[PDB]
């Protein structure tokens, strides 16, 4: 999390946390209720977001391995969408993209190239998922969620 | 002028112990200057001058 | 390393599952305790040298460990012990601020017993010093924060055992 | 050296955007304040000696050690040099106020100033303080004269300070 | 510019700007908006000016490198004509010949002699451009614009 | 690197004085503009790739620079030009966030002309590309934030010329 | 300033500011007015802070160069106290300990060892100044001032 | 000892001891009787050196932890003086400052800062001990002892 | 670097001949002065930090250099000046031991002027500081050894201008 | 590393007491033997290459160890064996001069057996060659110095065993 | 020179010379008179040493480029012998092999390989010169002379 980042930054200089790092830590822990609320919204609406994003994404990309008549491929794509929503919820909880980056971004291109899933299609699906997810967030809540969706999309492309 | 005593490195204080170191006719219409009304600042200026 | 939030996230992630309500409650506990943890970290950082001085005075000084033939004999070994106590204090502060003991396990207690045994460093004396450090910090910060830091001090002492 | 109009006109050809909307807007904004710049310069020129004298006296009040033995303003030789240099600064700041551009300060005031001051041991802290005192006195005189929107008057003085002062952070 | 000239004159004598110089500067700052309008008119109509003037110039001065069948020469000549029209507009913005002189009058003869382009042909082209420009300006605006054309012509004459 | 606050603090510190009311007013102005600065930074970050794409399309594509024998010929040089435009956009955003141009002086313009002349990179084409990028950013974020970003774009362009 | 730290943190990763940096920046911008008020309080009360802190410091630590009967040494110590209050005011304004660190903390041990001033005495004086400064502000106003005073004290040890 | 130092110097270039190292070795072993005599002098007179040096030190620096009414602190300071005399005797026997460097110079600042003992006070005490020790030695026998006392003082400052 | 013996050896070697009687006399002079040089080196080593403290107090303290806005203002610049003075003292001791100024030219002076000009360090102030250091050393050691060390201090001062 | 004088000093220091008369007598014995030790070191330095070639000629040559498939077959393995013998001789000379075997245990024998076992180097052949080197050195430097060096040669052989 | 070695060794650690290094320096400068005497001995007897060593070297190694009937080659060999005697004298004066190694040992194999002179022959000639030089000198003075001749021979082999 961001707390780990502050601790490691302090440890790199072999010193106690500086006032700036303590201020960042306090600002982060001040927003825990909001982060938990956002994660709860993401968890409760995960399947609805997946369904709406899948509908939009299959409208945008008709010839994709998910929409190719294979039920297992469709199920795997929708599970991937759910997993990425879960990772974004983790990142919202942690205050940084570290959980999402460590779980579903490092080596994402290699994994999806091995699976023969075109990365442009996944970027489009992430775009649709982001549009569906941001509609359930208030204006003050959408900054981090949109940033983490953008992080996934940038890692894929 | 005041001498600068006890400057660092002078040996005035031994160690980190600092307590034991102690123990013609005037021109026409000339008007004199009143010291009290002239002020301390201007008087110091004049005397140092 | 790992902190409380990352610990809960990794616990939920190994199951492919969101944070269950118990984990969300624990996360709320950590978020509420964050300000106290910051206060404790600031206090411990301000008096680190004083804490180590008091620890050494009340647990190691004027014993057989500083006499010739003891492990704190010679200035090099005294300085090594002092910097070891400094490491223990700083990384206990790190663990307290993070809310998790993983940093202690991966930075402090990573083969530390083997190193101490090979060098002849007394494990019992080090454990006594850690207990004295915990008592000193508890006197410095208070009761609740004292026991919060003592959790990680006791973790270090247990790891040395 | 260049004034604001010359620099803008040359940049019109340099950037390849020609006389577009942003350039026209900036030119109109600058020309709106031209009469005020001329008035500010007139006030500065009409009261130059008083401004410099007031600023140097306030400087010696805030730095009493400057005029004491061993100080840099010690003796009338160095006092006269102080007054002369503060007049230099005021004159070139008035030039920069008229021109609307800081190139005059760059070319005729700040080029090699640090080298000269290092060679002669002139302290830069008191120099910046004296420039700021002159700026404050000029602002007071402009307010007395009735001027209202005189933000641009701050620009030269502050700029000069930023150019001569050492980096602290 | 006149502002720069006044500042340099004051600086040479180690004196602040005199009241007369300040009055002159104030007058030009007052006229700045009118000069800006004139220059905007020049800029917005530069393509028609260059088109008509280039046609007239090739009519009156046919034995010129731009009128020789080389596409590159003709394109470069038209680009230069547009360049000089824009430079005259910018120097009208300033209000004195200083920017136009600094960009395209000092060394123009040397530059075009190195390029092997006759300077009399350039004088003819600038004359044609000046005529076309005067066709679309009022007499009052022409009084502001024409002297820069004349300065360029004088700087181009061998 | 200095931002608006650090610049004011430096100017006050060389005089050994607390911030005078004029510098305090400047500081208040910066604090008031901070919200717009953050919004502009977010907007530019969200559209950085599109901004550079439009800049290249409207200033460099289908010219002799991308033709064989041009400096944007071959894929490596095209990618390097795109990377340089990314550099300029990112550092202009940094300078806008800081409210001070010192970052561009210390990290962009220092030795840039010598490096470009050594590599053969066209300076005038770079200046025109920076102007195009400023126009694109202004069209994207509006007139006021566009002008604020254009201050630093113009600082870069003037340093290059 | 904290803004410079955020920008440098983003630049270290060659990326635009992440949502965490933006949130820190926005929080700091919001608190700027309170920071200005605290800096004004420190500036207008500097002399009484110095006097009361010096009185307490000489009561607690009588064996100091500032308490050795030398007028110049006392004046220099009180000037140093005023300078450190000014640096703490700078840091309060900037939202980070960067001004204090750059002007009065880096190389503080070397400078004061050259001057042969005991460092423990300076730590005690900083503690007294912190005690006298904290009494003039609210608890939330004192939250950051205490951190900066602690930063000076930690750097001196 | 100097023997180990010259062996290590030869080994750093992976060659047998050059004639310079051999001459150093010969000059060292020819002074063994003198070094033993000096070490015996230091050992015999250690107590009187400690007492006289401590008296002069308390005259010169009255305000120091070793005389504040604490018997244990006084005993510890006099024990430290005796220990440093022993280390200097070791150095004289070894022909090098290495024994003193390993036993009581590496980390001396850290140890005495942990003990909250001012370092300049220890420098003054070592100066007084040097004055006492060199006054019971020959003119030529005092060179090495003075060098080692200077080494201690320099390591402290 | 190069000392007196190496200097005489090289002077003979460029001519491809053994040391002539004048060079042998100079070598004997150096050999006889070696004892005084060693004593001076010991004295300077013992009081190096005190020498630098006295130098700073004599030439730099309570001047406009240490005042706010000065070059020795802030603690980091003060410490940097002290570090440079420490370098000067140590290398003057080296040169005095060697009997040659070659090490001073090689290690200290070759580029110091341009470095100081780039940093803005006042060269006149540092020359006055070096002369004050020479005075402090000649007061600590004596007249003859003080003059011998002042030879190299003067060489440093001349190389700084 | 540690030599005879340092060993005595450490033995006394671990008890916090000056050197007792027995330690002083041992120190005097070492000082008296130092001249012969230096003479032996000079002789071995002069005849190092001859010692190693005689060792190889009388121990390892014309056996199965140099025939194809042996550990001294190929030029690189022969050179490695010669280099190892050179190391043994040089560090035995170091140990003889120091009067202690600590240098041998720190620079040579620490993990040497494990390394040789990993590489397949025959330990018995190495011990035999060390014995041959001891005999060669004894022949070169005489009886007393021969056995003085043989002490450390036997220490090497025991460490290899 | 050993003085340069001590100074450079101290400088690599950024410290003033240690007491052991000062003792080495004092012992070296103490023996300057004997070094000057030995160097004068080598300078006076250089020609007869070269003549006798050349006679022995040509008797022992007759198949060498020197005595192949080329007068220039013979003269060059004699000059090289004189030059190496001079360098050994320099090393005796400096108390270290640094003059000899820096003038005639670093790159000696490269130079003589380029000259196409067999290195074994040069080693034999150096041995003959060493024997001749040791003849005209007492053993105590010849210690360093033999050491430096051996240094040359090792550098050539
Ligand atoms: C003090 C409480 C006790 C003591 C300490 C002591 N330790 C050593 C040596 C080492 N200590 C460590 C410990 C760490 N190093 C790290 O980097 C970390 C993590 C940040 C830790 C925990 C290590 C690795 C060593 C060995 C290497 C080294 O010395 O640097 C010594 C020196 C022992 C010696 O013989 O050299 C001492 C004295 N000893 C006591 O008796 C105290 C009870
Ligand atoms: C065709 C297989 C695919 C495709 C191509 C496409 N390219 C462009 C425009 C450009 N292409 C290049 C290419 C190169 N520049 C180089 O230096 C090299 C290596 C030698 C190459 C291959 C460039 C520079 C351009 C820019 C235009 C220019 O001429 O300067 C376009 C036009 C894009 C636009 O108009 O913006 C297209 C369409 N498009 C497809 O659909 C194919 C898969
Ligand atoms: C007071 C808390 C302690 C103390 C003070 C003391 N100070 C001096 C002299 C100096 N102090 C400074 C300090 C600074 N210079 C900087 O650039 C900064 C960073 C902003 C600081 C803090 C300096 C440079 C000096 C030297 C003199 C000068 O100003 O030029 C003294 C020495 C007075 C003397 O001349 O003897 C003293 C005693 N004394 C105490 O007892 C307190 C613990
Ligand atoms: C006397 C010259 C100064 C002084 C000394 C002082 N020392 C102590 C206590 C200790 N001193 C040591 C010293 C050493 N340990 C080592 O390993 C070595 C190297 C061989 C040395 C020199 C130690 C370990 C202690 C701790 C107690 C113990 O011995 O077990 C004190 C008392 C500390 C306290 O606060 O109780 C004092 C006062 N004090 C002065 O004022 C003199 C300048
Ligand atoms: C002290 C007498 C005066 C003074 C000095 C001063 N120096 C610096 C910084 C640097 N000085 C050097 C110089 C050297 N480089 C070398 O190789 C050698 C020989 C070993 C020397 C002496 C260098 C490299 C620096 C580093 C600069 C940096 O910070 O990277 C400073 C600090 C300057 C700054 O801007 O921070 C100062 C103040 N200044 C005075 O006013 C004294 C008269
Ligand atoms: C013949 C061209 C030259 C010659 C040679 C010579 N060699 C020896 C002895 C040995 N030769 C070797 C050779 C090798 N060992 C290897 O591992 C390899 C790599 C494949 C080679 C080439 C060895 C190991 C020896 C030692 C004896 C043994 O084989 O066990 C001698 C005899 C040496 C002695 O003193 O007994 C000789 C004479 N001599 C010349 O003059 C020719 C130029
Ligand atoms: C010769 C008597 C015997 C022999 C030796 C042999 N050794 C190796 C390889 C190594 N030898 C060492 C030893 C050391 N290296 C050091 O730095 C030191 C301390 C200064 C020692 C003692 C090491 C480390 C190696 C491995 C690395 C290397 O190859 O250099 C070989 C080569 C083996 C191979 O397979 O390459 C040999 C042959 N072998 C015999 O048969 C002799 C009895």
Automatic annotation (TrEMBL), chain B:
Q: Where in the cell is it found?
A: Cellular thylakoid membrane
Source domain of life: Bacteria
Descriptive protein name:
Phycobiliprotein ApcE
What the record says about family reads: Belongs to the phycobilisome linker protein family. Belongs to the phycobiliprotein family.
- Binding positions for (2R,3E)-phycocyanobilin 1? 45, 48-49
UniProtKB/TrEMBL annotation, chains C, F, I, J:
Primary localization:
membrane
Membrane topology reported for the UniProt record: Peripheral membrane protein
Do you know which InterPro entries this protein is assigned to? Answer: Allophycocyanin_b (IPR006245), Globin-like_sf (IPR009050), Phycobilisome_asu/bsu (IPR012128), Phycobilisome_asu/bsu_sf (IPR038719)
Which residues are (2R,3E)-phycocyanobilin 2-binding? 71, 76-77, 81, 83
Q: Which domain of life is it from?
A: Bacteria
Task: Give the subcellular location.
Answer: Cellular thylakoid membrane; Membrane
Residues involved in (2R,3E)-phycocyanobilin 1 binding: 62, 66, 71, 74, 76, 81
Q: Which family does it belong to?
A: Belongs to the phycobiliprotein family.
Query: Could you identify this protein by its name?
Result: Allophycocyanin beta subunit apoprotein
Name its species.
Chroococcidiopsis thermalis (strain PCC 7203)
From TrEMBL, chain D:
Q: Which residues carry this modification: N4-methylasparagine?
A: 72
Where (2R,3E)-phycocyanobilin binds, per the record, is at 77-78, 84-85
For this record, the Gene Ontology CC terms, alphabetical, are:
phycobilisome; plasma membrane-derived thylakoid membrane
Q: Could you say which residues bind (2R,3E)-phycocyanobilin 2 here?
A: 72, 77
Give its localization: Cellular thylakoid membrane; Membrane
InterPro entries tied to this protein: Allophycocyanin_b, Globin-like_sf, Phycobilisome_asu/bsu, Phycobilisome_asu/bsu_sf
Membrane topology annotation:
Peripheral membrane protein
- Which biological processes are named by the entry's GO terms? photosynthesis
Keywords, A to Z? Antenna complex, Bile pigment, Chromophore, Electron transport, Membrane, Methylation, Photosynthesis, Phycobilisome, Thylakoid, Transport
Q: Which CDD domains match?
A: APC_beta (cd12126)
The highest taxon in the source lineage is Bacteria
* Main subcellular location of this protein, as a coarse class: membrane
PANTHER family, A to Z: ALLOPHYCOCYANIN BETA CHAIN, PHYCOBILISOME 32.1 KDA LINKER POLYPEPTIDE, PHYCOCYANIN-ASSOCIATED, ROD 2-RELATED
- Which family does the record assign? Belongs to the phycobiliprotein family.
Name recorded for this polypeptide = Allophycocyanin beta-18 subunit apoprotein
Source organism per UniProt: Chroococcidiopsis thermalis (strain PCC 7203)
TrEMBL record, chain E:
Locate the N4-methylasparagine modifications and list their residues.
70
Instruction: Kindly give the SUPFAM superfamilies that the UniProt entry links to this protein.
Output: Globin-like
Query: Which residues does the record give as (2R,3E)-phycocyanobilin binding sites?
Result: 64, 66, 77, 79
One short Pfam name that applies is Phycobilisome
Q: Which residues form a coiled coil?
A: none
Q: Which organism is it from?
A: Chroococcidiopsis thermalis (strain PCC 7203)
Q: How does it sit in the membrane?
A: Peripheral membrane protein
Chain positions recorded as (2R,3E)-phycocyanobilin 1 binding sites: 70, 77
Compartments where located: Cellular thylakoid membrane; Membrane
A Gene Ontology biological process term: photosynthesis
UniProt record similarity statement: Belongs to the phycobiliprotein family.
User: What superkingdom heads the lineage?
Assistant: Bacteria
User: What protein am I looking at?
Assistant: Phycocyanin
Per UniProt, the keywords (alphabetical) are: Antenna complex, Bile pigment, Chromophore, Electron transport, Membrane, Photosynthesis, Phycobilisome, Thylakoid, Transport
Please give the GO cellular component terms listed in this UniProt entry: phycobilisome; plasma membrane-derived thylakoid membrane
Keyword check for Thylakoid: yes
């Amino acid at each position: 999390s961001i707390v780990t980042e502050l601790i490691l930054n302090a440890d790199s200089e072999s010193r106690y946390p500086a006032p700036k790092e303590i201020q960042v830590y306090q600002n982060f822990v001040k927003t825990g209720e909001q982060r938990i609320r956002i994660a709860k919204i993401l968890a409760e609406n995960e399947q609805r977001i997946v369904q709406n994003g899948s509908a939009r994404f299959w409208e945008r990309v008709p010839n994709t391995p998910s929409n190719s008549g294979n039920e297992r491929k469709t199920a795997s794509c929708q599970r991937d969408q759910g997993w990425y929503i879960r990772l974004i919820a983790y990142s919202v909880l942690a205050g940084s993209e570290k959980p999402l980056e460590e779980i579903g971004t490092i080596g994402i291109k290699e994994m999806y190239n091995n699976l023969e899933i075109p990365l442009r299609n996944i970027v489009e699906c992430m775009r649709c998922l982001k549009e569906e997810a941001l509609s359930l967030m208030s204006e003050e809540d959408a900054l981090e969620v949109s940033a983490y969706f953008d992080y996934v999309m940038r890692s894929l492309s | 002028p005041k001498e600068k005593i006890g400057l660092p490195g002078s040996g005035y204080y031994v160690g980190e112990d600092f307590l034991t170191a102690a123990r013609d006719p005037l021109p026409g219409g000339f008007r004199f200057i009143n010291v009290s009304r002239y002020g301390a600042v201007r008087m110091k200026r004049s005397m140092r001058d | 390393m790992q902190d409380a939030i990352t610990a809960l996230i990794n616990s939920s992630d190994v199951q492919g599952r969101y944070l269950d309500p118990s984990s969300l409650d624990k996360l709320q506990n950590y978020f509420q305790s964050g300000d106290m943890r910051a206060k404790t970290a600031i206090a411990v950082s301000a008096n680190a040298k004083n804490i180590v001085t008091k620890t050494v005075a009340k647990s190691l000084l004027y014993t057989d460990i500083t006499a010739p033939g003891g492990n704190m004999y010679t200035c090099r070994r005294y300085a090594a012990c002092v910097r070891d106590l400094d490491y223990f204090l700083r990384y206990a502060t790190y663990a307290m601020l993070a809310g998790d003991t993983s940093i202690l396990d991966e930075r402090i207690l990573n083969g530390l017993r083997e190193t101490y045994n090979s060098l002849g460093v007394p494990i019992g004396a080090t454990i006594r010093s850690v207990q004295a450090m915990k008592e000193v910090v508890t006197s410095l910060v208070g009761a609740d924060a004292g026991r919060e830091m003592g959790v990680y001090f006791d973790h270090i002492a247990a790891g040395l055992s | 050296m260049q004034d604001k109009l010359t620099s803008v006109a040359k940049n019109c050809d340099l950037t390849g955007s020609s006389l577009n909307r942003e350039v026209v807007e900036t030119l109109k904004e600058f020309l709106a304040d031209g009469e005020k710049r001329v008035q500010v310069a007139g006030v500065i020129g009409s009261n130059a000696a008083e401004i410099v004298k007031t600023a140097v006296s306030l400087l010696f009040q805030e730095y009493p050690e400057l005029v004491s033995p061993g100080g840099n303003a010690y003796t009338t030789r160095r006092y006269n040099m102080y007054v002369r240099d503060m007049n230099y600064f005021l004159r070139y700041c008035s030039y920069a106020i008229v021109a609307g551009d800081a190139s005059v300060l760059d070319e005729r005031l700040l080029a090699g100033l640090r080298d000269t001051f290092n060679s002669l041991g002139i302290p830069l802290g008191p120099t910046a303080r004296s420039i700021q005192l002159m700026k404050n006195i000029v602002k007071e005189k402009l307010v007395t004269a009735g001027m209202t929107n005189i933000t641009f008057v701050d620009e030269p003085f502050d700029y000069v300070v930023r150019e001569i002062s050492e980096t602290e952070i | 510019s006149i502002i720069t000239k006044a500042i340099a004159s004051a600086d040479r004598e180690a004196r602040y700007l005199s009241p007369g110089e300040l009055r002159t500067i104030r007058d030009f700052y007052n006229g700045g908006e009118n000069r800006l309008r004139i220059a905007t008119t020049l800029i917005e109509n530069r393509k028609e000016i260059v088109e008509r003037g280039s046609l007239k110039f090739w009519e009156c001065c046919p034995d010129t490198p731009s009128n020789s069948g080389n596409r590159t020469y003709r394109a470069s000549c038209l680009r230069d004509q547009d360049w000089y029209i824009r430079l005259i507009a910018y120097t009208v913005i300033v209000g004195d010949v200083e920017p136009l002189k600094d960009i395209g009058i000092v060394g123009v003869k040397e530059m075009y002699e190195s390029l092997e382009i006759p300077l009399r042909n350039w004088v003819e082209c600038i004359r044609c451009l000046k005529e076309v420009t005067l066709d679309l300006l009022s007499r009052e605006d022409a009084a502001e614009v024409t002297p820069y054309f004349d300065c360029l012509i004088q700087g181009m004459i061998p």
